[PDB]
Each structure stands twice: as structure tokens, then as C-alpha cells.
Design a protein around this ligand. Structure first.
Ligand SMILES: [Mg+2]
Length: 294
């Protein structure tokens, strides 16, 4: 598994390493100078980051009751965004998935497709990570396995041509969803920026409001570095939500807060473990409840 079990699996390392300490520190406690300096140090170690740690401390200082209960309120506020997907009135619903290679983009494409097929929608997956034969093949493996069409060209195709084709196909055959997997090669900033912008622009040849959602995959296990990378994808295209993967893999689950406050983009999905069912819609209230449980 249920919603809370999933989050307990997600947050096990984070709690064991860092947030259990936070809970013990603040439970039934009034925030004094010592407690503030210890909490600051803990949150920084937990990848909450400089800006969000300070915001939290500033907000805690505004209350003179149970500091742990105040903390719960504050974090819920930081995570208090609209997590829903921007589905258009008429299909297809086009989602462009972006992020660096190695973060679980392809897997997340597959897991989203499963999610929609289970809801009983028709899905087209676009293999627009065109220069990686392995990823193209991984997307084919997901398409057959979850019950989704895959648009793809032989390795080395133009990704915008693949993205264009996938949307045109979905549109000509009245298909419900298009999920576009994109490239995330890192050694080339300007080129990736231009490629992603091209894919984003070309789908408007067919559907002016598409992509209706541009989801950035961030791998929680990459901590601050992943957050630095994320700012790059924010420059490239209008990112409308985050898929935060591999939460269970690290004690760095505090990075969720840094992402929310620093980037300002809703976290729409979180991934825990490998199972297809392990990509789930993000539930801010449940997340905090689990994070700050004794
Ligand atoms: Mg990947």
C-alpha cells in the first residue's frame, strides 16, 4: 504494498541515517540555540541543502510549541504543490520525459506506460533517445511487456522525427497517450539543449499544446549533483513536474525538499525499487507522515 508501505520502503535509509535523529531531536522540544545548530547540521548532512535548511529554521523560529509538529507543518508547506498530470480535453496526451542518462528515464517511461494501460488508456511510447541502441531496445522491452505501441527508427535517427512520428501516429489512430523518451548524453550542453528544444517544438506541428507535461527524472541517489543537473533541463525546456527515482537506494531522501523549494516544480511521481508498480504518484502528506514518524 500500500501507499504507506511504499513510502516506508522509500524512506528507510533516510530515516535510519538522518530523520530518526531529527525526530528524536525535536519531539516534544522547543527550538533553542543548541537544538537549532544541531538540526541545521543534520539537515545539511541529509541533503536538504543550504537554502531550504535555512528556510525551515526561519519558519521553526516562528513558533513556541512542539518543534517536531511545527516541522511537519513546514515541510508539508514546502511540498504543497499540485501533483496532478495536465491531461488535455482531447487525446492524445503527450508527455516528454527528460533527464540525464542513468537516472531511470527509460524505466520510468515503461512504468508510466504501465500506469496508463492499467487505467485502460492506449499508449504510444516514442524511442527518441535515438543514438543509444541499448535504450531503444529497453523501450521496446517495456512496450511489449506493458501493452504499449513503440515508435522507433533504426539507431541514429533524428529524435524530433521520431517524436513527430509518434505524435502523428497517436493522432491518426486516436491513441490516448504519447510518452517520449529523450536523450540525456551529458558531455554536450548546447547540443542537448538544442535537441530537447527541437523535440518540444516539433510536436506542435501536430498538437499546439503538446507536450502537455514535460517530466524531469531526478535520481535521488545523485544528491546535490542531480539537483545541479536539473537546473540545466529547466533552462532547456519548460519542465512541468519531477519524477524522483531511486528513493530507497540512498539515505538522501531529504533531497526531495531541496528539489521542491529550490526548483519550484511539482514532484509528481516517486520511484522506490525496481518493480513496475514501484513508480507512484507523489503524496506530500503521506511522505511527511512517514518521514517524521517515530
Ligand atoms: Mg536511464
Amino acid at each position: 504494498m500500500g501507499l504507506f508501505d511504499f513510502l516506508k520502503k522509500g524512506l528507510q535509509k533516510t530515516k535510519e541515517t538522518f530523520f530518526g535523529r531529527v525526530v528524536k531531536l525535536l519531539k516534544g522540544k522547543k527550538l533553542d540555540d543548541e537544538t537549532r545548530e544541531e538540526l541545521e547540521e543534520l539537515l545539511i548532512q541529509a541533503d536538504v541543502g543550504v537554502e531550504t535548511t535555512e528556510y525551515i529554521l526561519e519558519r521553526l523560529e516562528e513558533k513556541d510549541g512542539d518543534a517536531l509538529e511545527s516541522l511537519k507543518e513546514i515541510i508539508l508547506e514546502i511540498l504543497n504543490f499540485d501533483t496532478k498530470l495536465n491531461v488535455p480535453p482531447e487525446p492524445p496526451f503527450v508527455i516528454m520525459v527528460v533527464g540525464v542518462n542513468g537516472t531511470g528515464k527509460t524505466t520510468s517511461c515503461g512504468k508510466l506506460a504501465k500506469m496508463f494501460v492499467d487505467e485502460g488508456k492506449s499508449v504510444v511510447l516514442a524511442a527518441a533517445d535515438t543514438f543509444r541502441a541499448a535504450a531503444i531496445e529497453q523501450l521496446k522491452i517495456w512496450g511489449e511487456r506493458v501493452g504499449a505501441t513503440v515508435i522507433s527508427h533504426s539507431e541514429g535517427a533524428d529524435p524530433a522525427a521520431v517524436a513527430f512520428d509518434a505524435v502523428a501516429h497517436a493522432l491518426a489512430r486516436n491513441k490516448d497517450v504519447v510518452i517520449i523518451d529523450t536523450a540525456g548524453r551529458l558531455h554536450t550542453k548546447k547540443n542537448l539543449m538544442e535537441e530537447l528544444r527541437k523535440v518540444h517544438r516539433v510536436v506542435k506541428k501536430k498538437i499546439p499544446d503538446a507536450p502537455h507535461e514535460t517530466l524531469l527524472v531526478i535520481d535521488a541517489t545523485t544528491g546535490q549533483n542531480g539537483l545541479v543537473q536539473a537546473k540545466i533541463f529547466k533552462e532547456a525546456v519548460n519542465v512541468t513536474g519531477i519524477i524522483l527515482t531511486k528513493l530507497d537506494g540512498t539515505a538522501k531522501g531529504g533531497i526531495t525538499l531541496a528539489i521542491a523549494r529550490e526548483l519550484g516544480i511539482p514532484i509528481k511521481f516517486i520511484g522506490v525499487g525496481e518493480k513496475a508498480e514501484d513508480l507512484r504518484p507523489f503524496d506530500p502528506e503521506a511522505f511527511v507522515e512517514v518521514l517524521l514518524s517515530e
